[PDB]
Design a protein around this ligand. Structure first.
Ligand code: MN
Lengths: 154, 345, 173, 173, 173
C-alpha cells in the first residue's frame, strides 16, 4: 500500500512551493512536474535522473539550499528558473528516497556536501533504480496533480 | 434553566444557580440575594409570611437533586407538550410528503415511511429535516413554519429543533421483494444511527457526534450525509440554516451537472483527487484541489460553484463493520449523486 | 391630524432617504427608552417589495410587514402609489405597547401593486448577517432616533431584539 | 441621611442602654404593626458575639445572625472601635419587608477583635429557656420603639418570634 | 501552620506588595495542577478599590471578591487597619474545590476604610483587556508559584480558567 505517499507528496510540495520564490520558477516547476514523470516511465529512471541532474546545475549554493530545505523549510532556491525548477524536482525525488528509507539521510546529505561522493550517490541510485522506479510512481503522480492544481497555468 | 426565566425572576435564578460548588454548598448562598424577591411586596399585599428560609432552601434542593444528578425533572406538561409538538409535526410532514409525489405508509410522531420518485428525495429531506426542527420556506397546508415554532396562523406552537432526526433512503427496483427492502431500510438506519460517528463542532471545538445522519443505498453503494455539524443542533436562533446544508450543496451540484455546465466525469474523476483531499488538512490546499477538480471537467470554463470550507475536514468515523463507507464527506457527496443519478437506469 | 411615516424594514440597502420629517413634531411612536424597541406596528396581509421596497398588497393572513411608525412624509414627490390611510389610532395592532396614541393617525406607507404578470407565492424571511442590522442602525437609526448612541451604552439590547422580533415576509420573485 | 446602628439579641444582656436618645433619626422603618417584627435590617458576613458581646468578624458565610435595627448616637465610647458605612440603600440585607425605602443611610457597625490566635467555631442554637424569652424585650423594645406600650399591649405575638426568628449561632469560646 | 495572607486579582496590579515572603511555610490550600487553579479562595462582603486597592467592608448582600492564597506577611507593620483571623480550618470557602485542608490556619485579608463619606457603587467585575492579565501571570504564578508554568506549556487552558473565575466587585471611583 502507498497511501502514505499522499502525505509525503503534500509536505514535499509545500517545501518546494514555498522555496521557489519567483512565480516563473513555480510555473517552470509545474512544467517539470508534468513532463518528467512521463519521461521517467517511458524512458527509465536512470536516463531521466541523468537528464535532471544535468539541468539542475548542482553547485555549492544550490546544494546547501537543498540540504537546508531538507531541514529548515525557510530556505529559498534562487538561480535561473529553469535550473531552479529542475533542482526542485531533484529535491522531490531525493526527499521521497529519504523519507521512505531507500537512501539514508546521512549518506545522501554527506554526498551533497562533497564531490567524491556525488558520483557514489549516483552509483547508489543506479543500483536501486528498479526499486525507485517501482515505488516512486504514486508519489510522483500526486506531485504532478498537486502542481497542476496549486500553480497557475502559464 | 437559568435563561428560561425573564424580567427579574431570571436574576432570581441567574445568581442562585451556581452557588453550590461556587458557594458554601448549602441554603445560605441565596439568603443574601433572596431579598430582590421581597423587593416588590407591598402594593396589594396578599402573602401570609415573608420568612423565607424554606423557599430559598427548596429552590436550592430542587436544583441540587437535578445538578448533583444532571438530568431534567419531567412533568405531565413536559410529556403532553412533546406529544402535541409531535402531532403538529405529523400534520406538517403529511403535507410535505404529498407536496412531492409522495405516498405515506406510516406518518408517526417521530418517525415516517413513504415512497417517492427518485427525483424528489433530497429536496424532500432537506425540508422535512428543517421542517422537523421548525423552519419554513413555505406555508404547508395553512401552518406557518417560523423559526423554532410552528405558528398556526396565530398559535405559535413550539417545534423540536433540538431533537435530532435521522433518515434512511433506499433506491429500490420495483421488482424487488418488499420484505427485504423494508428490513434493510430499518436495519440500515437501525445500526447506521448506532454505528457512525462524524467530526462535529461542540462548544466551538471539535467533537465526534453519533446521530442525525441521512443514509442512502442504491444496491451496494451506501452513502451518508450528516445533517447538523453542530452540537446542540441549533444553539442560536439563526442556526436554522446549519441544518441539512450539505443537501443544499448536493442540490446545487446535481442541478448544474445536467444543465451542461459540468461534465458527467465529475463523479468519475473524484477517484483521482480523493486521496490528496483526504490526505490534506490545510483547508486552502483542499479548497484549491476541489476547485481544480471542479474546473477540469467543466463544459464551459466560467462556472464557479464552490463548496464551503467547513465541509472539508469532517470525517465519517465508521468502525468495525462489513459495510463500506468512505471516511470523508466529499466522497459521500459524490456517492449520494452516484446513487441518485443511478436511480434512473 | 398628525401625519406619519411607516418605515418598512427589509434587509434592502434602499431605505436611504424616504423619511423627510426627521424631528418635525413632538412624538414619534416607535420609542427606544433604555429598554429597547417598543411601540412596534405590524400590519398583516402584506409583504415586502425588495425591488424598490414597499408593502405589497396581498390577501394571505399569515403574511405581514413588521415596520416602524414615525411622523413623516416621503420626499414630496408622491401621493401617487403610497398608501395614504387614516385610522383613529386605535386599531393599531402594536407589539410591546407601553402607551396609547393621539386617537387619530394619518400614515404614509410604502404601497406597491401586485404587478401581476408572474407567480407570487409567499416567502418568510428574517433579518440576519449582523452587518445587515449594523448597516441600518447607521442608515436610519441615528437619523430618526437620536436617543440612541448617547443615552444607551447597552447598544446590544437594542441590536438584539431586532434579530428576534423584526421579521418580514419577502417575495423572492 | 440618617444614622442606623445595629444591635444583636443575645440570651445574655449586652444592650440595656448604649444610645443617648431612643429616636435618633427623623423617621424609623423597623416597627410593630401587629404582624411580628418588621423591616429588620440584618447583618450577614459578621458573627454574633456572646462573651464580650460585640460584633466579631469570621470567614464563614453560613453564619446568619438576626437582630434589630435601632438608631441613634453611639454613646461616645466608639467610632474608634466602631466602623461605619454609608450606602445607597439598595445594599441592605432586610427580611420581612413592609414597604421600600429610598434614602441613603449611615449604618453604624460594631466591631470586635477576630481573636487571631485561636480556633473559633459556632453551633446552631435558637433562643430557648423561656426564662429568657421575656428578658431581652424589657431592655430594648420598651425604650426605643415608642409604638410599644402606646399602641399594643398584646406582646404575646412577640413572645413567640424570639425562639424562631432571632436565631444566632452559639460560640462556646 | 502558617499565618496565611490573601491575594485577590483585580483588573490591575492593585495587589503586588502585600506578598513579602512569597514562600513562608511549605504547602498551601490553593491547588494549581495542570488544570487551572483549584481550591481558590474568596471573601464575601468586600470590594476592591482602584486608589487604595484594599477590600472595603460592606453589608452589601452582593459583594464578593475572590483570589489566591500565597504565603508570607503583608509588612509586619500594618494591622492598625488590616483584618486578621485564625480559624480551625472548618470555616473555609474554597471555590472550585479539588484538595484537602491545611491544619487550622490563620488568615490575613486586605482591608479599606468603610469611610461613610461617598456613595458606594459596586458592579460585578470580571477579567478582560488581557494586556494587564499577562504580567500578573508572570507576577502571581511565575515568580511565586514554581510548579505552575514549570510543568504545563498550555497557557491557553489556564487563561480560560482565569478569565472566568475571579468574579469581584469594585467602586470604580
Ligand atoms: Mn431501535
Amino acid at each position: 500500500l502507498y497511501e502514505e505517499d499522499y502525505k509525503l507528496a503534500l509536505e514535499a510540495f509545500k517545501k518546494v512551493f514555498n522555496a521557489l520564490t519567483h512565480y516563473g520558477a513555480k510555473q517552470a516547476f509545474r512544467s517539470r512536474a508534468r513532463d518528467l514523470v512521463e519521461e521517467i516511465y517511458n524512458s527509465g529512471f536512470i536516463p531521466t535522473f541523468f537528464y535532471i541532474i544535468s539541468k539542475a546545475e548542482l553547485n555549492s549554493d544550490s546544494l546547501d539550499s537543498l540540504i537546508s530545505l531538507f531541514s529548515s523549510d525557510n530556505a529559498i532556491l534562487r538561480g535561473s528558473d529553469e535550473n531552479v525548477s529542475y533542482s526542485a524536482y531533484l529535491f522531490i525525488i531525493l526527499y521521497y528516497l529519504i523519507k521512505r528509507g531507500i537512501i539514508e539521510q546521512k549518506f545522501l546529505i554527506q554526498a551533497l556536501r562533497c564531490e567524491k561522493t556525488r558520483l557514489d550517490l549516483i552509483d547508489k541510485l543506479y543500483n536501486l533504480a528498479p526499486i525507485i522506479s517501482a515505488k516512486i510512481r504514486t508519489y510522483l503522480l500526486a506531485i504532478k496533480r498537486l502542481s497542476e492544481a496549486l500553480i497557475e497555468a502559464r | 434553566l437559568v435563561n428560561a426565566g425573564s424580567g427579574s425572576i431570571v436574576d432570581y435564578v441567574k445568581t442562585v444557580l451556581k452557588c453550590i460548588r461556587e458557594n458554601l454548598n448549602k441554603c445560605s448562598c441565596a439568603e443574601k440575594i433572596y431579598s430582590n424577591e421581597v423587593a416588590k411586596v407591598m402594593f396589594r399585599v396578599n402573602v401570609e409570611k415573608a420568612n423565607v428560609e424554606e423557599e430559598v432552601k427548596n429552590s436550592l434542593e430542587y436544583f441540587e437533586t437535578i445538578l448533583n444528578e444532571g438530568r431534567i425533572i419531567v412533568t405531565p406538561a413536559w410529556h403532553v407538550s412533546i406529544s402535541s409538538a409531535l402531532n403538529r409535526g405529523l400534520l406538517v410532514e403529511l403535507e410535505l410528503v404529498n407536496k412531492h409525489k409522495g405516498f405515506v405508509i406510516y406518518a408517526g410522531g417521530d418517525d415516517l415511511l413513504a415512497m417517492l420518485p427518485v427525483d424528489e428525495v433530497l429536496d424532500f429531506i432537506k425540508e422535512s429535516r428543517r421542517a422537523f426542527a421548525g423552519f419554513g420556506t413555505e406555508k404547508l397546508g395553512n401552518m406557518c413554519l417560523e423559526n423554532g415554532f410552528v405558528r398556526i396562523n396565530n398559535a405559535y406552537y413550539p417545534s423540536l429543533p433540538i431533537v435530532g432526526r435521522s433518515y434512511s433512503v433506499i433506491i429500490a427496483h420495483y421488482a424487488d421483494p418488499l420484505f427485504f427492502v423494508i428490513n434493510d431500510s430499518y436495519n440500515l438506519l437501525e445500526e447506521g444511527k448506532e454505528i457512525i460517528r462524524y467530526r462535529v463542532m461542540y462548544n466551538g471545538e471539535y467533537k465526534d457526534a453519533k446521530k442525525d445522519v441521512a443514509i442512502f443505498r442504491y444496491q451496494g453503494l451506501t452513502s451518508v450525509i450528516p445533517l447538523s455539524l453542530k452540537r446542540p443542533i441549533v444553539s442560536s436562533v439563526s442556526d436554522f440554516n446549519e441544518i441539512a446544508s450539505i443537501i443544499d450543496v448536493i442540490l446545487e451540484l446535481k442541478k448544474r451537472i445536467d444543465e451542461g455546465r459540468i461534465s458527467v466525469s465529475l463523479l468519475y474523476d473524484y477517484e483521482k483527487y480523493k486521496h490528496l483531499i483526504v490526505a490534506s488538512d490545510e483547508k486552502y490546499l483542499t479548497e484549491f484541489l476541489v476547485k481544480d477538480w471542479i474546473k477540469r471537467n467543466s463544459l464551459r470554463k466560467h462556472v464557479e460553484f464552490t463548496i464551503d470550507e467547513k465541509l472539508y475536514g469532517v470525517r465519517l468515523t465508521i468502525e468495525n463493520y462489513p459495510i463500506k463507507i468512505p471516511n470523508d464527506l466529499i466522497s459521500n457527496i459524490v456517492y449520494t449523486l452516484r446513487i441518485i443519478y443511478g436511480g434512473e437506469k | 391630524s398628525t401625519q406619519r411615516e411607516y418605515v418598512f424594514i427589509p434587509i434592502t440597502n434602499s431605505i436611504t432617504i424616504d423619511v423627510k420629517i426627521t424631528i418635525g413634531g413632538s412624538d414619534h411612536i416607535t420609542n427606544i427608552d433604555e429598554r429597547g424597541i417598543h411601540n412596534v406596528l405590524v400590519i398583516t396581509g402584506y409583504a415586502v417589495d425588495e425591488k424598490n421596497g414597499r408593502l405589497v398588497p396581498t390577501l394571505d393572513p399569515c403574511d405581514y410587514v413588521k415596520g416602524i411608525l414615525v411622523a413623516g412624509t416621503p420626499q414630496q414627490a408622491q401621493s401617487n402609489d403610497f398608501l395614504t390611510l387614516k385610522l383613529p389610532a386605535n386599531k393599531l395592532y402594536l407589539i410591546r405597547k407601553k402607551g396609547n396614541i393621539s386617537d387619530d393617525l394619518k400614515i404614509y406607507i410604502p404601497y406597491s401593486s401586485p404587478d401581476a404578470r408572474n407567480s407570487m407565492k409567499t416567502k418568510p424571511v428574517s433579518i440576519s448577517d449582523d452587518t445587515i442590522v449594523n448597516n441600518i442602525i447607521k442608515e436610519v437609526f441615528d437619523k430618526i432616533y437620536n436617543i440612541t448612541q448617547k443615552e444607551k451604552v447597552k447598544i446590544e439590547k437594542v441590536k438584539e431584539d431586532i434579530k428576534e422580533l423584526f421579521s418580514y415576509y419577502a417575495l423572492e420573485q
